[PDB]
Amino acid sequence: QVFNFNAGPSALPKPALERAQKELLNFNDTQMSVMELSHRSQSYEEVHEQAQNLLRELLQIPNDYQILFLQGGASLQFTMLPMNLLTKGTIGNYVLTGSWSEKALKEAKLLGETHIAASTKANSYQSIPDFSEFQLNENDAYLHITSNNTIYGTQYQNFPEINHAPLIADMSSDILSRPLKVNQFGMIYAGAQKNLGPSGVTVVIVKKDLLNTKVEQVPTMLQYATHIKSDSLYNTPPTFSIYMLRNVLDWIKDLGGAEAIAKQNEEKAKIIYDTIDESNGFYVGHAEKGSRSLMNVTFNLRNEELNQQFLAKAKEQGFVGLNGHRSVGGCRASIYNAVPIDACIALRELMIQFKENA
Amino acid sequence: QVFNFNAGPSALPKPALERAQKELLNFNDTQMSVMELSHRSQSYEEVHEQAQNLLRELLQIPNDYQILFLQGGASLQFTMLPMNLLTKGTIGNYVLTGSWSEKALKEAKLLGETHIAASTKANSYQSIPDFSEFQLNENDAYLHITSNNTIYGTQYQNFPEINHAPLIADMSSDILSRPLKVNQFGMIYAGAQKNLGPSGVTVVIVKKDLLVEQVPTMLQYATHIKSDSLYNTPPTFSIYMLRNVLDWIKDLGGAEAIAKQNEEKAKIIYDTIDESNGFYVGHAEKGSRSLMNVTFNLRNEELNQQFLAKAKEQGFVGLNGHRSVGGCRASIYNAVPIDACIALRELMIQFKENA
Numbered sequence: 001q002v003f004n005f006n007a008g009p010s011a012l013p014k015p016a017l018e019r020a021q022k023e024l025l026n027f028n029d030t031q032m033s034v035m036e037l038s039h040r041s042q043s044y045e046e047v048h049e050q051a052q053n054l055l056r057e058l059l060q061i062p063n064d065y066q067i068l069f070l071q072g073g074a075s076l077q078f079t080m081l082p083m084n085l086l087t088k089g090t091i092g093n094y095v096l097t098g099s100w101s102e103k104a105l106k107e108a109k110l111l112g113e114t115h116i117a118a119s120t121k122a123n124s125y126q127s128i129p130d131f132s133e134f135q136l137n138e139n140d141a142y143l144h145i146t147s148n149n150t151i152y153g154t155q156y157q158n159f160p161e162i163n164h165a166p167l168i169a170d171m172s173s174d175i176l177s178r179p180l181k182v183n184q185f186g187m188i189y190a191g192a193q194k195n196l197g198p199s200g201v202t203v204v205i206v207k208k209d210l211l212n213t214k215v216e217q218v219p220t221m222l223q224y225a226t227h228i229k230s231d232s233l234y235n236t237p238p239t240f241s242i243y244m245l246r247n248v249l250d251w252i253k254d255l256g257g258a259e260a261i262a263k264q265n266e267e268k269a270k271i272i273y274d275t276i277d278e279s280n281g282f283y284v285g286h287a288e289k290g291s292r293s294l295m296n297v298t299f300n301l302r303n304e305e306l307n308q309q310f311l312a313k314a315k316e317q318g319f320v321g322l323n324g325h326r327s328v329g330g331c332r333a334s335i336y337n338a339v340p341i342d343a344c345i346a347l348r349e350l351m352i353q354f355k356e357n358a
Numbered sequence: 359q360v361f362n363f364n365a366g367p368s369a370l371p372k373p374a375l376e377r378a379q380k381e382l383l384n385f386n387d388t389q390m391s392v393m394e395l396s397h398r399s400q401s402y403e404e405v406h407e408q409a410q411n412l413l414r415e416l417l418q419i420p421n422d423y424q425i426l427f428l429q430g431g432a433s434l435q436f437t438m439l440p441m442n443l444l445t446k447g448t449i450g451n452y453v454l455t456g457s458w459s460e461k462a463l464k465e466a467k468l469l470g471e472t473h474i475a476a477s478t479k480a481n482s483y484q485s486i487p488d489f490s491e492f493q494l495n496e497n498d499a500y501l502h503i504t505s506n507n508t509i510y511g512t513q514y515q516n517f518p519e520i521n522h523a524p525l526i527a528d529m530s531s532d533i534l535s536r537p538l539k540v541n542q543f544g545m546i547y548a549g550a551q552k553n554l555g556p557s558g559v560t561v562v563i564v565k566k567d568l569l570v571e572q573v574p575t576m577l578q579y580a581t582h583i584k585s586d587s588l589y590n591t592p593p594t595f596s597i598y599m600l601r602n603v604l605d606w607i608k609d610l611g612g613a614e615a616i617a618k619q620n621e622e623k624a625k626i627i628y629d630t631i632d633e634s635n636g637f638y639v640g641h642a643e644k645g646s647r648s649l650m651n652v653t654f655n656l657r658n659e660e661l662n663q664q665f666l667a668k669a670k671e672q673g674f675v676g677l678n679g680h681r682s683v684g685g686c687r688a689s690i691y692n693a694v695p696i697d698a699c700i701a702l703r704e705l706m707i708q709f710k711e712n713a
């Protein structure tokens with residue numbers, strides 16, 4: 001028995017993988033793998049377009065937004081965003097809700113003026129700040145948020161209404177886990193490898209008229225305009241990763257889309273949070289209740305010996321990935337879209353038995 | 359029958375793909391796909407390291423070089439290189455031998471002073487320039503070359519001895535198609551999708567001591583050197599597939615063995631051109647002919663199109679020349695089998711006979 005709670009890359013839906021396996025050598029009757037095709041072939045172009053069209057349908061992306069498939073991870077977006085929008089005289093304004101927020105801010109600092117609109121750093125990132133706390137500037141180039149703080153296990157419940165500057169979000173660890181009002185945002189980005197399949201592609205949803213203009217001085221590959229104009233085919237795309245993304249999106253659609261996956265995600269999170277909350281303090285969640293993530297459940301036992309013993313027992317029992325991020329310790333159960341509910345049931349049973357036997 | 363002459367992405371070895379298929383759902387008895395592993399897992403780290411190790415073995419890469427696995431393609435390397443090495447008061451010196459050389463030069467021009475050491479652009483990139491012609495500067499940051507000019511079908515036969523600045527090569531379309539003396543270079547880079555693997559990873563071989571205040575973290579070579587290409591999430595499946603391809607090259611006997619195969623493949627196509635009494639004409643001067651991309655045309659555009667149509671009908675994929683130049687291009691990277699080249703010859707001979 002294996003229970004895959006990996007935090008990134010992570011569990012994929014089996015039908016996406018079974019589909020890939022079956023056609024790995026002969027895709028679309030071509031007698032070639034999708035990995036062996038030109039990105040200008042009809043067979044690949046169909047995949048590339050269908051991945052865009054599925055994202056558009058599933059997230060209800062408006063027609064004045066474009067979907068980009070880029071290399072480099074979310075980490076490259078931390079620099080590409082300020083390179084394109086943080087112009088002289090303006091400010092990259094950041095809401096700090098975890099380590100990934102900090103990493104995004106650091107890159108902007110290398111390129112221009114920055115600001116902290118709000119932060120829960122002083123309290124170790126246990127919550128999302130109230131929107132009334134946000135300190136905004138008239139010359140903000142953007143306001144950047146991290147929707148799901150993967151290391152700390154906290155998540156935005158809803159999103160602020162920002163009118164003075166575009167709202168930008170790193171949605172790497174919760175994109176397409178629930179319905180989204182895309183028109184609240186100027187840009188959304190996500191490495192695919194948490195909730196959308198493959199590592200090696202980053203999905204960037206951009207309001208076209210904010211970013212389709214040449215930016216003086218910026219290298220060709222680092223301009224959003226390059227990728228918008230070329231439909232993410234300026235250079236050779238990560239064709240297998242985009243194919244796998246397509247397959248995962250087909251699965252999300254098949255299961256009922258964003259609304260259906262939100263229902264599933266709420267149920268399997270509740271299995272784990274109820275286990276914590278019924279444990280009389282034997283397990284302690286990091287997040288405040290009102291900010292608990294549906295995607296990454298972070299917790300500790302009462303001391304580090306017990307944390308070690310629990311994690312060792314989990315590994316013995318077939319659980320993969322439960323060690324917390326190195327920077328914070330404890331435990332982290334990553335329960336992205338494709339993690340099956342019976343893995344969560346199994347984790348509950350492990351947690352109850354370990355408590356009882358301690 | 360399908361014959362895959364695609365120019366990038368390209369044919370992969372059947373054993374590498376079959377291996378990937380067999381274990382796609384259960385890698386190394388983990389009951390997970392390699393795609394479902396954490397990149398901080400021992401399971402993935404072993405694969406990552408093995409890909410590096412096989413490259414090191416196969417190319418005989420000295421210990422004072424590091425092997426990086428990056429995202430962004432060779433095209434991102436066109437900017438990342440000058441971003442790291444083209445410092446104030448220095449020159450990015452380029453040898454132009456085709457369109458890919460021009461694209462690299464263009465990105466350096468945005469970031470600092472550039473220069474053209476030598477160029478065969480005036481004669482439509484039919485040859486590699488004589489090294490004795492290179493115009494070098496004391497303050498060169500580097501000398502950049504393109505080892506195989508993928509669109510023009512020309513290739514360096516050997517490499518210049520440069521010691522005033524590091525020699526840097528875009529080897530996208532010929533890396534690990536033959537032995538190399540890596541000590542001639544300060545840096546080699548290649549998108550994987552011609553000779554090494556699927557698209558989505560870029561191999562960068564860099565002299566460690568060669569390689570920056572103000573450069574974004576992801577765009578510093580130092581970041582990736584210090585983190586062993588695990589600073590952020592790597593393209594795990596692409597690196598796995600690279601490993602599988604490298605195991606296939608090793609199993610057939612390594613770089614000398616693949617070179618012999620590639621020389622035989624190329625010989626079949628060039629002999630067919632040369633024996634055709636001018637019905638097929640190669641673009642490249644004989645002395646510069648590529649072993650990786652064979653470029654040619656028929657005597658007029660109507661016949662070019664007729665030939666390409668017939669090829670497509672008979673199962674050949676990818677033979678249309680690059681749009682910028684027209685004609686035909688047979689890409690015969692490592693994993694393109696000799697039987698496909700034989701088949702292309704036989705098509706070419708029949709086509710001429712029926713013309």
Ligand SMILES: *Cc1c(COP(=O)(O)O)cnc(C)c1O
Nearest residue numbers: 073074075100150172191590591
């Ligand atoms: C993992 C993650 C990242 C980093 O993504 P890479 O693709 O590894 O660069 C950034 N942001 C968040 C919220 C993440 O979870």
Ligand SMILES: *Cc1c(COP(=O)(O)O)cnc(C)c1O
Nearest residue numbers: 235236431432433458508530549
């Ligand atoms: C294919 C090619 C490139 C472009 O590679 P991308 O991965 O598409 O950026 C660069 N240089 C040469 C010589 C090529 O053949």
Ligand SMILES: [Cl-]
Nearest residue numbers: 098099149151
């Ligand atoms: Cl975080």
Ligand SMILES: [Cl-]
Nearest residue numbers: 007150151325
């Ligand atoms: Cl993380």
Ligand SMILES: [Cl-]
Nearest residue numbers: 456457507509
């Ligand atoms: Cl070229």
Ligand SMILES: [Cl-]
Nearest residue numbers: 365508509680
């Ligand atoms: Cl090309």
Ligand SMILES: [Mg+2]
Nearest residue numbers: 250251253254
């Ligand atoms: Mg369906």
Ligand SMILES: [Mg+2]
Nearest residue numbers: 340341342343
């Ligand atoms: Mg089950």
Ligand SMILES: [Mg+2]
Nearest residue numbers: 483484510641
């Ligand atoms: Mg030529």
Ligand SMILES: [Mg+2]
Nearest residue numbers: 605606608609
């Ligand atoms: Mg072997």
Ligand SMILES: [Mg+2]
Nearest residue numbers: 629630632633
């Ligand atoms: Mg002869």
